[PDB]
Every structure is written in structure tokens, then in C-alpha cells.
């Protein structure tokens with residue numbers, strides 16, 4: 365028992381990080397087979413990033429202008445192209461440590477692990493959620509761009525995020541591995557509007573199930589509710605609507621604990637209307653929404669990866 | 671910016687995990703050079719663990735009774751010995767992925783990353799603190815024993831923890847890599863007394879500095895205090911005494927932010943006496959004590975590892 369914020373093991377991704385330098389700008393790249401993927405603003409000077417024309421800047425670059433280093437070994441760049449907001453550098457050497465992998469675009473509310481890197485070297489690993497407003501609350505410093513987010517399925521690494529930028533309130537934004545931004549953002553140093561964020565209801569419910577599995581059961585009440593009535597109450601507290609798809613995804617946790625999803629919704633409704641009365645759930649004094657139903661299952665049932 | 675619970679990258683440790691089976695009991699082992707380290711209760715049946723005589727049980731085992739698997743490859747055991755609560759299995763093959771490493775015994779209040787494993791395979795990574803009562807609040811299921819805790823310094827893995835047992839309130843206990851337990855515990859399935867836990871004061875202060883570095887500054891007051899006067903107040907709230915050694919360790923964060931350690935102590939004192947008035951610090955509604963001063967520095971300054 366016990367329940368912690370848990371990341372995927374990072375080793376398979378560690379084997380793919382390199383550093384990419386163009387002129388005087390250095391950031392991280394992801395080396396898979398004979399291609400290195402990295403954020404396109406590696407080609408910018410500081411002045412360029414206030415209003416860059418990326419197509420124009422790349423025109424004046426040739427292959428040899430990109431210094432790619434995998435450890436102390438330089439990887440010769442033999443081609444390059446730009447795909448939305450990422451650059452793809454073809455190199456003369458395939459990465460022998462390339463894992464089985466896919467590029468996926470995750471949905472809001474879904475979680476992933478981030479391997480935060482500087483100069484091509486890993487610094488740490490943490491877990492994040494894609495917020496409903498398509499930001500993430502990460503931890504990133506200068507030089508972190510090209511750090512990736514991922515999930516693991518047995519032996520397959522699903523890469524879902526590459527880091528590009530920080531809005532001055534500690535809110536982070538980036539792209540999938542095809543270079544398309546999550547959310548209505550662009551890779552330019554200028555002020556930009558994000559949507560109001562909301563609470564990921566299905567994840568809160570998953571975490572309440574984790575609490576029950578771990579013996580923290582005080583908030584369970586004797587009532588049920590309808591899905592409509594719960595959603596009306598949750599709207600007022602800036603919670604996302606709970607859909608039948610969400611109810612179906614919660615089925616394994618409901619079956620394991622013997623608590624109907626709508627009964628847990630009745631317990632959450634009381635918590636929203638009355639507060640926690642100074643109490644904690646799984647050590648937290650707030651309702652936690654960055655654990656998915658699968659996160660709870662893989663932690664509480666010990667799923668491993670090859 | 672941003673501040674998250676961050677683990678060390680786990681790849682170097684992933685390369686060292688194997689599974690160890692003796693009879694019908696299977697758990698994890700740590701394979702370094704030509705030695706596999708694992709908890710000694712791998713030699714027990716379920717009945718044995720209620721009151722085991724480990725020396726007696728090991729007498730009747732020979733090398734061939736230990737099945738060690740590194741992936742799908744069996745490692746031939748060619749010798750064995752027991753060191754306190756860990757077994758050491760000599761194998762005929764040195765692990766080619768052995769990193770630079772040390773075995774260290776950490777002090778209470780110090781943190782480490784745990785790579786939770788089942789059947790020799792990694793499931794996830796999370797960060798833990800050695801509590802003042804020598805327990806940890808981990809997340810561990812059946813088969814997790816032999817999972818290790820560690821810190822990383824550039825390229826050197828400092829192994830500090832191997833997991834052995836859970837007390838029925840989700841409290842975990844284990845040994846250093848010489849098999850000596852942290853705390854007054856033994857590897858027997860019987861009820862055992864742990865000390866009252868306390869709050870790690872120097873870590874709370876480190877986390878308040880992390881808050882200031884990230885722009886969360888509302889709790890800073892205009893007062894200072896003496897070390898004596900602060901410790902008198904913190905005693906009442908079950909906080910560990912703050913020592914001059916602690917004050918010295920906080921120096922880098924104090925210098926970076928320009929807030930004297932005793933001035934931060936004055937701010938913490940007000941928080942203890944008055945509460946947070948419904949407010950959060952770095953997203954938390956409680957004071958957090960599982961970040962060390964070094965944890966804050968390595969996250970907020972982007973220290974990497976080879």
C-alpha cells in the first residue's frame with residue numbers, strides 16, 4: 365500500500381537524449397533511429413525569438429551548422445527539415461538504443477512523465493497532466509527545451525510532449541512530436557492568452573478510489589446521485605463535466621472497490637459543497653486531479669515495463 | 671520556473687535490476703559487478719516469515735537453489751553469503767551495465783529516489799524521505815522487496831535503501847545495502863513499535879525558499895527571530911530542532927534569495943502559530959517537508975547527471 369506521485373522509469377528515454385547547438389543556442393534533442401527531433405527555435409538568436417520567421421532563418425542554415433552531441437561523440441548531420449514547430453535532423457548514425465516507440469497526441473486530462481534535461485543530459489523525472497487549457501504545470505529552466513513527455517506500455521515508449529516555452533506564471537506549453545502545439549500558442553516571445561483552467565473530474569474520482577484502496581475512507585457517504593445532478597453541481601466549482609465514457613473508464617476501480625461510480629460521485633459532491641473540514645485524503649488537504657484511472661491501476665496493481 | 675516532486679533519472683539503476691527466486695518466493699535483486707544483492711527473506715516460505723531463523727534456512731540452501739534472471743537470461747549462482755538482512759549471490763557473469771556506485775547510509779530527513787520493481791522489472795520511480803522515525807512513506811505491493819532507493823552525483827549512483835516490509839498503516843521500512851535496518855525493526859512478520867514521527871524543519875525551510883524563488887512570497891513577514899526562540903516554538907508543533915549545521919546548509923538558498931535563514935524562521939514561526947489562512951504555497955495547502963536544501967538547488971538550478 366501507499367500512494368505517491370509516480371513517474372515511468374526513464375531509462376529508455378535517457379538513451380535517446382542528445383544536445384543540439386546552432387550557432388550560440390543550445391537545447392535538447394530526441395535521437396530515434398537516424399533522426400534527431402528538437403524545437404525549431406534552436407536556430408534563433410535571442411533577438412530572433414521576439415518575432416521569428418522560422419522559414420527564413422532555416423533557409424540560411426546548412427547541415428554543418430547543427431552540432432549534435434551524443435555524450436562526447438558528435439553526430440554528423442546529413443539532412444534537415446522542419447515539421448510544424450520541430451526540426452528533424454537526419455544524422456549519419458542510427459541510435460543503437462532506440463526503443464520501440466510511437467508518437468501520440470494526448471488528450472486534456474491525460475498524464476505523462478517528463479524527463480527534464482539540460483545540455484542533452486537528464487536532470488530529473490516528474491509526472492504532469494495536460495491541463496484542460498492545454499498547459500502543463502512543469503518545472504523547467506533555461507536550456508530545458510527539447511525535454512520530452514512520455515508514457516510507457518510494456519516495451520513501447522509513447523512520446524507525447526516536447527517542451528518549448530513558459531508563460532511568466534510558471535505555466536508551460538509545448539508540442540507533440542509532430543511539432544503541433546497543444547493549445548492556442550505559438551513559439552514566439554510575446555504575451556498570449558490561455559483559457560481558464562478547470563479541474564479534471566474523472567481524475568479526482570480515480571484518486572478518491574486510490575484513497576479507498578489505501579484505507580482512507582472517511583469521505584464516503586451513504587448517498588447516490590444521477591450523472592446529470594452531479595454535473596450540475598460540479599459546473600459551479602469549475603469541474604469538467606463527467607461523461608459516460610469517463611464512467612466506463614472508472615469501471616475497473618469501481619469493480620475492485622465495490623463502490624458504484626455514481627456513489628463516489630455523491631461523495632465527491634458532498635466534498636465540493638462542504639469542504640474537507642480540515643481533514644486530509646492520502647495526505648493531501650486538497651482534491652488531487654493529476655492521477656488518471658490508469659495511473660491508479662498501474663500503481664496499485666504493480667504494472668511493470670520491459 | 672515551477673516546482674515539482676522530482677526523482678533522479680532511473681536508467682542507471684534500471685540496468686541493475688534482476689529477479690531472484692528461491693523455491694516459490696520471488697523478489698527483486700540488485701546486480702552490481704558479479705554480485706546480486708537481495709533481501710534475505712527470499713529464502714522463506716510464508717510460514718517461515720512469522721518467526722524465521724535465517725541462518726538455519728540458508729544452511730539448507732545451495733547455490734543452485736537460487737534462480738537469478740536478468741531479462742530472459744539465467745545467471746548462474748556460484749557462491750552466496752548473508753550480510754545482516756541481505757543476501758549476496760555471487761554469479762558467474764559481471765553486469766556490463768554496472769554504473770559507478772557507492773553504498774551509503776543516509777540520515778533522517780534526507781531524500782532519495784525509489785525505483786519500484788516487480789519480478790525484476792521496473793514499474794515506476796518516486797521520491798521519498800527517510801523520516802525522523804526511520805520509516806519512509808513509499809508505495810509498495812507484494813513482490814516489491816529488493817527495490818532500491820538511491821541518489822545520483824554526476825555519474826555515481828549512491829544506493830541507500832533496499833525495501834523489506836510494510837507496517838499495516840502504509841509505513842515502509844528497509845535496510846541500507848549492507849543489510850542493516852534503518853530504525854528499530856527486524857524482518858519478521860510480527861507487530862513492531864515505531865517512534866512518533868516529526869516534521870523535518872530544515873526541509874520545510876528549504877521548500878519555503880523554493881516558494882520564494884518561484885514567486886510565492888505572501889508568507890514572508892517583516893520580523894526576525896533567534897534560533898533559540900524559533901526552536902522553542904517549533905518544539906510545540908512537533909518540528910525537529912533546527913541546528914547551526916542546518917542553518918549552514920541553508921546558506922546557498924539564503925544567499926540566492928537574499929533572505930536570512932533566521933528571517934525565514936520568523937516567517938515559518940508565524941505560519942505555525944497562525945496557519946495558512948486557507949492559502950497555498952507552491953500549490954500545497956500544507957507545509958511540505960520532503961524536499962532537502964540540495965533538492966531545491968538541483969531542481970531550481972538544473973543540475974544534470976552523466
Ligand SMILES: *C(=N)[C@H](C[C@@H]1CCNC1=O)NC(=O)[C@@H]1[C@@H]2[C@H](CN1C(=O)[C@@H](NC(=O)C(F)(F)F)C(C)(C)C)C2(C)C
Pocket residue numbers: 391405408413504505506507508509510527528529530531532536550551552553554555556671
Ligand atoms: C527552452 N529552452 C526555453 C524553456 C523556458 C525557459 C524558462 N522556462 C522555460 O520553460 N524556452 C524559451 O525560452 C522560450 C522561447 C522564446 C522565449 N521562451 C519562453 O519560454 C518565454 N515565454 C514566452 O515567451 C511566453 F510567455 F509567451 F510563453 C520566457 C519569457 C523566456 C519564459 C521562444 C522561441 C518562445
Ligand SMILES: *C(=N)[C@H](C[C@@H]1CCNC1=O)NC(=O)[C@@H]1[C@@H]2[C@H](CN1C(=O)[C@@H](NC(=O)C(F)(F)F)C(C)(C)C)C2(C)C
Pocket residue numbers: 365697711714719810811812813814815816833834835836837838842856857858859860861862
Ligand atoms: C516484499 N516483497 C514485501 C513488501 C510488502 C508487501 C506489502 N507491502 C510491502 O511493502 N515484504 C513483506 O511481505 C514482508 C516480509 C514478511 C512479511 N512482510 C510485511 O511487510 C508484513 N509487514 C510486517 O510484518 C510488519 F508489520 F511488521 F511490518 C505485511 C503484513 C505482509 C505487510 C517479512 C519477512 C517481514
